[PDB]
Amino acid sequence: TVALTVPAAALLPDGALGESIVRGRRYLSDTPAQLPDFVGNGLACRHCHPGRDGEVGTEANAAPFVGVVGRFPQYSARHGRLITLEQRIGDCFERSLNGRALALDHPALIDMLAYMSWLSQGVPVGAVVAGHGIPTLTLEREPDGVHGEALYQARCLACHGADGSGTLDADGRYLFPPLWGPRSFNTGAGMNRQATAAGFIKHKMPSLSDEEAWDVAGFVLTHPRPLF
Numbered sequence: 001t002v003a004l005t006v007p008a009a010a011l012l013p014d015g016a017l018g019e020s021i022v023r024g025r026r027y028l029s030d031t032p033a034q035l036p037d038f039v040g041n042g043l044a045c046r047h048c049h050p051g052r053d054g055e056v057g058t059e060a061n062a063a064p065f066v067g068v069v070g071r072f073p074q075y076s077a078r079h080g081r082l083i084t085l086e087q088r089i090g091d092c093f094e095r096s097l098n099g100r101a102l103a104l105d106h107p108a109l110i111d112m113l114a115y116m117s118w119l120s121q122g123v124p125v126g127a128v129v130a131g132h133g134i135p136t137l138t139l140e141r142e143p144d145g146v147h148g149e150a151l152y153q154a155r156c157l158a159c160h161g162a163d164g165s166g167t168l169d170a171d172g173r174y175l176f177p178p179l180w181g182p183r184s185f186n187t188g189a190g191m192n193r194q195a196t197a198a199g200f201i202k203h204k205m206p207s208l209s210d211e212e213a214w215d216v217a218g219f220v221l222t223h224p225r226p227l228f
């Protein structure tokens with residue numbers, strides 16, 4: 001694998017590409033507000049693909065976009081065939097944002113691609129970046145949702161709410177996003193899988209033990225959310 005690196009915003013090119021990258025960043029950080037026809041819930045891309053310093057998709061083990069463009073096209077078991085990055089983004093619009101895929105030549109889609117290509121600057125095509133994806137966490141026992149409930153109240157609730165509905169910021173965007181219910185991700189999302197949720201929670205919290213991450217993920221995933 002190659003190391004995860006984040007290019008400097010100060011070195012962005014003047015011109016059409018620079019401008020596109022900037023719009024891309026915004027669509028990824030502010031998605032429900034910038035793309036209302038395509039988003040069906042309260043989530044922005046940055047709520048599962050967080051980043052430091054205004055960027056999006058730059059954190060190891062939280063599915064960073066750094067280096068993503070060199071990994072597509074790739075086989076998708078979901079589709080039964082090779083898919084492009086444009087299509088992969090479409091899947092997260094339909095599942096994670098409970099919405100609709102943008103047309104494959106939609107200029108907002110091309111802006112998001114330009115942003116991801118900028119983040120992938122210097123990464124060799126084909127190379128795998130350290131920290132890519134969300135590494136799964138799997139324990140050899142059932143997730144204990146009773147224990148999980150107690151852990152939720154002690155470690156999560158303060159941010160994500162008793163009802164899992166999250167906390168709105170002053171501008172109507174989620175400061176702390178919703179974890180279940182009608183504004184959360186739908187059942188088709190990868191985050192609706194126990195080992196992916198457990199792994200995401202384990203790595204994004206710093207901190208929880210493996211058993212704790214496993215059990216609280218189980219509790220979160222007992223709740224209703226939109227059907228895909």
Ligand code: HEC
Nearest residue numbers: 046047048050152155156159175176177178179201216220
């Ligand atoms: C207690 C262990 C928990 C659990 C189970 C979760 N969280 Fe959070 N969370 C917070 C913020 C600002 C985000 C957006 C991403 C970021 O910038 O880091 C998240 C994201 C999540 C997700 C994915 C998004 C979703 O809506 O499903 C999940 C599954 C999740 N969290 C679970 C903020 C906080 C906190 C404020 C300091 C605290 C405490 C937690 N989260 C704790 C938990």
Ligand code: HEC
Nearest residue numbers: 043044045047048063088089092093096133134185190191
């Ligand atoms: C949590 C509810 C998510 C939101 C909101 C979005 N995405 Fe997502 N994405 C999510 C998971 C759990 C994964 C799988 C990670 C893995 O281990 O592979 C993804 C994956 C992507 C990818 C593929 C990344 C790769 O390395 O292959 C892309 C390009 C992607 N997601 C884009 C994306 C965009 C553009 C979003 C806002 C529209 C978005 N995602 C939201 C979980 C979530």
